[PDB]
Amino acid sequence: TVSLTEKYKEFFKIGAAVTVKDFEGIHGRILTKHFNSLTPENDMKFERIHPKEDFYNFEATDKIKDFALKHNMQLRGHTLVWHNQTPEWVFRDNDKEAPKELVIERLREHIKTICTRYRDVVYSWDVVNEAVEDKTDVLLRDSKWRRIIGDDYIKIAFEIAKKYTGNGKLFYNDYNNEMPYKLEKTYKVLKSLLEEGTPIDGVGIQAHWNIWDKNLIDNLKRAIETYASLGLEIQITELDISVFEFEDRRTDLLEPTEEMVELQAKVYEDVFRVFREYRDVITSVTLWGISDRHTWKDNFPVIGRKDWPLLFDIDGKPKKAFFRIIDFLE
Numbered sequence: 001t002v003s004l005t006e007k008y009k010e011f012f013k014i015g016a017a018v019t020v021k022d023f024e025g026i027h028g029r030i031l032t033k034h035f036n037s038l039t040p041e042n043d044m045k046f047e048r049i050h051p052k053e054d055f056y057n058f059e060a061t062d063k064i065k066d067f068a069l070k071h072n073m074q075l076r077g078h079t080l081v082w083h084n085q086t087p088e089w090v091f092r093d094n095d096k097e098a099p100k101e102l103v104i105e106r107l108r109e110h111i112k113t114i115c116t117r118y119r120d121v122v123y124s125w126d127v128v129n130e131a132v133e134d135k136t137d138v139l140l141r142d143s144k145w146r147r148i149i150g151d152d153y154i155k156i157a158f159e160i161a162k163k164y165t166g167n168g169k170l171f172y173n174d175y176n177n178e179m180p181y182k183l184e185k186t187y188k189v190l191k192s193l194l195e196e197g198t199p200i201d202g203v204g205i206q207a208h209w210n211i212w213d214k215n216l217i218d219n220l221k222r223a224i225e226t227y228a229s230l231g232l233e234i235q236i237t238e239l240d241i242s243v244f245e246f247e248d249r250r251t252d253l254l255e256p257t258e259e260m261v262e263l264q265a266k267v268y269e270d271v272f273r274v275f276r277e278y279r280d281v282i283t284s285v286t287l288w289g290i291s292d293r294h295t296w297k298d299n300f301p302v303i304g305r306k307d308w309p310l311l312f313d314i315d316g317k318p319k320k321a322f323f324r325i326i327d328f329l330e
Helices: 025-034 059-070 100-118 144-149 153-164 180-195 216-228 258-277 320-325
Strands: 013-018 037-040 074-082 122-129 169-174 202-205 208-210 233-242 282-287
Touching (some): 013 025, 074 100, 074 233, 100 153, 180 216
Parallel strands (some): 013 037, 074 122, 233 282
């Protein structure tokens, strides 16, 4: 019974994505033993915490914060500005589209309100999430934030958040951003934001990975080096390691194959060895979930199947991958 966080205390924070139900039963005990960082899985998303202009839902996030404070943990704030889960009131002005400066003012108020409430426990914020275009040639993903505020909206969000976040670190967070095509694109955007004085402290690599990606290790090294060459910290923000290739949508498996279990333990040992290696630039590694009992990979990208992407199994027990990644000395 080595604690993962205690084992990694000299390298980086060890975090898990949570909702309030995780504070109960086995998940509760796993968190308080092994993790010193929590990311609210959903409860800080714009639409969830701020569903109408005059209505915030602070209860779930307060509980997460109260939990973190009671157990000596800190939060990641996920996430302020994202093309998904942003309610439609933000972009409407009675029966018309809201203009740029009204949207900015709404965003300023939302950031002030939420960052003021939680900056005492939050050590890093995903200020902007998934702004870089994943599918076409163009740099920036089309979104209502982008359409209405214009291409400056990333810098604008960061300069706002900076005002209200104390000294939490401010992150740009995205997925596949270790892959060759997306890494290049994201390098350009970040380098250009930083050249314009945007107070971005770090890049979040979501790390939705799978056991079959033969390029993973080399991509991950090349990514960390490239972002670090910008002066940026790196956080691994949503790590899980699916047993399925992304396009393998089979729904029959009731448990992982033995090839799966063994490949997964190796992939985990391997990425954590990379994490340890770049420990001067990685400040936190968060897993997107606690145990395979509850994972968003059961419904994404296939509704209603089962995946086993995490470090603890369906009964809450340390998997092979767990004993793999605690296997080193400092």
